[PDB]
């Protein structure tokens, strides 16, 4: 009847980690990995599961270096039950490399990020979406590392792969175009960020308002000549990257002294909820 | 004044930013200089007051964000006209501040104002009348008023369905906020077929047509639950951001609360693991739409 109390525990880990209760959910997932251990041994799959569980819950408590030591150990487990090249493993490399890049240590981060990356190749095939998010990660341990070289190169092959893969209105191609934009911003080529948020803003337009014409323009173009002369509710639903894209353009005018265009686009900004240049790292949740 | 001009400049990039505490004293100085120079019952000190009642609304400083916006109102009033756009924005913005402090009694007949001046100028089954009945269901809810509040939910429902796709966020949202209604009355049946209808709909667009092969969560848990004796013991990451939507995460934690009141543990167990990876005691908040046109 252990197998019957086990089954039990894992209901209550998982009610009570849904419900973001960790003072309960924690003790419960280390009484399911001591009741796993002596059943079944360390080595067992079930056993890496527990530990990403609760690797997960020390991500929301920002525990990090705990996270991280639970993950190396399932991470040895996956390897040895499932194989090197499962995408579970894959997806426990991309989770360590996250733990360490929030923590500053890069140099450890990529080659973990980069075995993830051949064995989403391996298992999805070279042009698959989810190749596409990993090159997004890895571009962001390459870009703090300085490799900007390598960053442009990952950010161009993962937005070709979303934008022929998923629409050009997908949420992932905004997402990496602002990722690539901050890239461009460490390298002090603005012009080439100012460009991708104006594609950013004109695209959502045109979705919204049809083509751009005179009468119907982008914020940016209603911005620009605002500084050379010193029923829609319901679309509201139809982004916070939207909202970063706003106050990132809206920085750079400010940059170039055009103060009237920071304005508008920054108005725009309060309505719709120092560059803010924030890494953030996609998590693979599949990892279960 | 170019000092008027620096200080709407400052005020704007300090609360872009969530820097409050530099943006209300240059908003109050501003508004103070602006007094001084142009007449008060002007657009512009209206624009400011707004301004200053978003700062105070993300303070949560309820009453005195209401304080600025009945200021606002009474001079948008006299300008604009008592049937503008504008107007209903304030109208519900001041409803949803006084929903926000408890004040329902208070709060209903601005929602009901604001519902009439839209209704007049974009008709009766426009999307955006929709919107504002979502907020004029929520305030009743609120009251008890159980047989309005679902009449409101349906008819804003009615319109989405028809004016939009079945495949719009409005429709998802709402039919939410109903099941939430349904949840407080305890007509639990009637929020888990909603809750269903919602997940079924979500899985058809991102993973196509339902066949044995293809089912949503909820097919999968109800299974799992039948085959408890029977139970013997793929990338699509790219899907997950599009497909993690707050309302989807609701929706699988109340249906896994409900699977879990029938004494269904193994059907509550895959929807709360699927609401893990997405991020009897339900998730019931009342989510107010406010008016940004203002």
């Avoid at 527990?50 to 990090?64: F, T």
């Avoid at 000549?225 to 005018?253: I, Q």
């Amino acid at each position: 009847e252990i197998p019957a109390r086990l089954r039990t525990l894992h209901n209550l880990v998982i009610q009570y980690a849904s419900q973001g209760r960790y003072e309960v959910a924690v003790p419960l997932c280390k009484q399911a990995l001591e009741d796993l251990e002596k059943t079944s041994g360390h080595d067992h799959p079930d056993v890496a599961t527990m530990l990403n569980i609760l690797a997960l819950v020390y991500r929301d408590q920002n525990k990090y270096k705990d996270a991280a030591n639970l993950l190396n150990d399932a991470l040895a487990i996956r390897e040895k039950t499932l194989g090197r090249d499962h995408p579970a493993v894959a997806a426990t490399l991309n989770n360590l490399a996250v733990l360490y890049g929030k923590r500053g240590k890069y140099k450890e981060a990529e080659p973990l990020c980069k075995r993830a990356l051949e064995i989403r190749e391996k298992v999805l095939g070279k042009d698959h979406p989810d190749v596409a998010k990993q090159l997004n990660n890895l571009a962001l341990l390459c870009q703090n590392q300085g490799k900007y070289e390598e960053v442009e190169y990952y950010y161009q092959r993962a937005l070709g792969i979303y934008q022929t893969k998923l629409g050009p209105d997908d949420p992932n191609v905004a997402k990496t175009k602002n990722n690539l934009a901050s890239c461009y911003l460490k390298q002090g080529k603005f012009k080439q960020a100012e460009t991708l948020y104006k594609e950013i803003l004109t695209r959502a337009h045109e979705r919204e308002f049809g083509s751009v014409d005179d009468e119907n323009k982008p914020i940016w173009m209603h911005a620009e000549e605002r500084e050379e002369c010193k029923g829609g509710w319901y679309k509201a639903c139809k982004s916070p990257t939207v909202t970063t894209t706003l106050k990132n353009l809206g920085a750079l005018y400010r940059r170039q002294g055009k103060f009237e265009a920071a304005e508008t686009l920054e108005e725009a900004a309060m309505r719709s909820r120092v560059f803010t240049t924030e890494d953030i790292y996609e998590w693979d949740d599949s990892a279960i």
